[PDB]
Amino acid sequence: VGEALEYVNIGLSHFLALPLAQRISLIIIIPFIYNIVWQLLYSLRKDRPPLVFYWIPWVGSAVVYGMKPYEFFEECQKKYGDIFSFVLLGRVMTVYLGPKGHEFVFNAKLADVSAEAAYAHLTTPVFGKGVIYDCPNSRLMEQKKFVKGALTKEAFKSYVPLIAEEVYKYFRDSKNFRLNERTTGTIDVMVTQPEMTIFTASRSLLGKEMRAKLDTDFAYLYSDLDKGFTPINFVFPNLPLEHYRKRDHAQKAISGTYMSLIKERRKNNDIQDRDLIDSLMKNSTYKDGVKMTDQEIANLLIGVLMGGQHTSAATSAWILLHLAERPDVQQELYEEQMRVLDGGKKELTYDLLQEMPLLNQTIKETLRMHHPLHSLFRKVMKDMHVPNTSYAIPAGYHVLVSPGYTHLRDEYFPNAHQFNIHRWNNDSASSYSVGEEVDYGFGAISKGVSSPYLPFGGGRHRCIGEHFAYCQLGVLMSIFIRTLKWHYPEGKTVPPPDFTSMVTLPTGPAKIIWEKRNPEQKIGGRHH
Ligand code: HEM
Ligand SMILES: O=c1c2cc(F)ccc2nc(-n2cncn2)n1-c1ccc(Cl)cc1Cl
């Protein structure tokens, strides 16, 4: 054998003397083969959930996942059931589909999984520091407690006329509408809905100063910060290219603006309750006694607005697109508007919004068929055992939960692919805890997360903007419905979703034709 141990040696030297043709050829075929072999070996573990097969190492199933994630999920579900892992741009994602999925990931022990470990690389470049996913979970919990303290029923009662004012101003002044000079037109909902979202959100959460700056060049900074919030930040987070530093410019620029306004409200004492900025100023002292720096506060503002911008605008687009081919639902929604607002002689209020169940059902149903975030991740911190199986999810893996996939399942939603607001009759609540509650720092929320309809997640990371979004979407749709009818151009229909972005947007252009319900109606106020 010693004459073979000489030969491993010899053979080794001859490898180092291959032409660079075969050397490069080998540095690609050696890893390709080991990859394929490791998988076959992997499939013989019985404490591991089935791993989706793939050819290209590191990249894994990222193509099909990234492009059509629900269909990926469905085919995986058919060959392996509800638990399966797949590889994604260097990471291993264990997907648990269905309500026990929600349970296993949303109700995971703090010690078992990390949300900030998963998200901070995407969000921190964008929002700034010391906030959201750039702090310990405990801090997050109190930050949510803060924000949510400006998301009160009385807050909502002041925001509603402000939001309405913005919609009306938008109809009057935007080149997309100009209702005072045109009775009909075509809009890209993907153009209109983002401006409407930022305008209304800005004016209400950030106040009238901050809204006004959007009428200037300053608005482009929101657009710059916007582009840095993209999945590419997951694999290539900081690359010395130009989109990355207009991003960082904007983060600095916008944050500075808030601090400018923050500090000068304190150097006066223009501290009321008008907006979230007032609120966070009066209310951002942690339980251990620390106060949020002005910088942190501002970064928390950026985060809050960013999160409500994309989800809400997408939902707003989808509502318009689904209704554009359902003049019966527009008709139904309009009658409810007339009955609740007494033919329009009542002014819209947060209270009156709550008495529009069909309106809220449309929001509800849209959020069902078009959940904004098709995937939520965690990273596993301790080996997790999955009941009732032999599976251990080893630390360093990622768990992926996808309530939006469950939303589109016939098992839990009869005719799941049919837009039907009436599947929610006598049931228009944004959401409700259907049993016992629990509190993590920002208020009592559902303890069980087994509801097959989970648009806002659950557990410690559960959303806190649900009521803001229904408020915004409510006022928005109330006014669209009372002002306009709208339909598709010839042979157009509901676009299919673009899953590749951070949010599941419709595939643009998604155009609708509007026409005034009342051609001779003039929106008041003044423009130049
Ligand atoms: C249609 C609108 C929205 C939908 C469908 C939605 C959905 C969600 C979901 C699924 C989560 C949980 C994320 C996870 O567990 O990994 C979440 C979290 C959160 N959302 Fe929303 N959201 C919406 C709007 C908003 C708005 C308007 C705001 C703020 C004004 C907001 C702020 C937040 C915050 C602060 C969290 C906490 C995240 C954490 O603790 O990790 N969201 N949202
Ligand atoms: O970062 C994320 C986020 C990151 C992901 F990788 C996936 C989904 C996400 N979903 C949300 N949102 C949930 N509601 C609104 N946005 N946020 C997020 C969470 C909290 C805040 Cl303040 C802002 C954002 Cl964008």
TrEMBL record:
- This chain's protein is named sterol 14alpha-demethylase
Binding-site residues, heme: 463
TM stretches of this protein? 24-44, 51-67
Q: Which GO terms of type biological process are on file? A: ergosterol biosynthetic process; methylation
Q: Which PROSITE patterns match?
A: CYTOCHROME_P450
Q: Which Pfam families match?
A: p450
Where on this chain does heme b bind? 119, 133, 144, 378, 461, 463
Output one GO MF annotation. iron ion binding
Q: Its Enzyme Commission number?
A: 1.14.14.154
Q: What GO cellular-component annotations does this UniProt entry give?
A: membrane
Q: Which family does it belong to?
A: Belongs to the cytochrome P450 family.
Catalyses: a 14alpha-hydroxymethyl steroid + reduced [NADPH--hemoprotein reductase] + O2 = a 14alpha-formyl steroid + oxidized [NADPH--hemoprotein reductase] + 2 H2O + H(+); 32-hydroxylanosterol + reduced [NADPH--hemoprotein reductase] + O2 = 32-oxolanosterol + oxidized [NADPH--hemoprotein reductase] + 2 H2O + H(+); lanosterol + 3 reduced [NADPH--hemoprotein reductase] + 3 O2 = 4,4-dimethyl-5alpha-cholesta-8,14,24-trien-3beta-ol + formate + 3 oxidized [NADPH--hemoprotein reductase] + 4 H2O + 4 H(+); 32-oxolanosterol + reduced [NADPH--hemoprotein reductase] + O2 = 4,4-dimethyl-5alpha-cholesta-8,14,24-trien-3beta-ol + formate + oxidized [NADPH--hemoprotein reductase] + H2O + 2 H(+)
Q: What class of enzyme is it?
A: oxidoreductase
Domain of life per record = Eukaryota
Q: Which compartments does it reside in?
A: Membrane
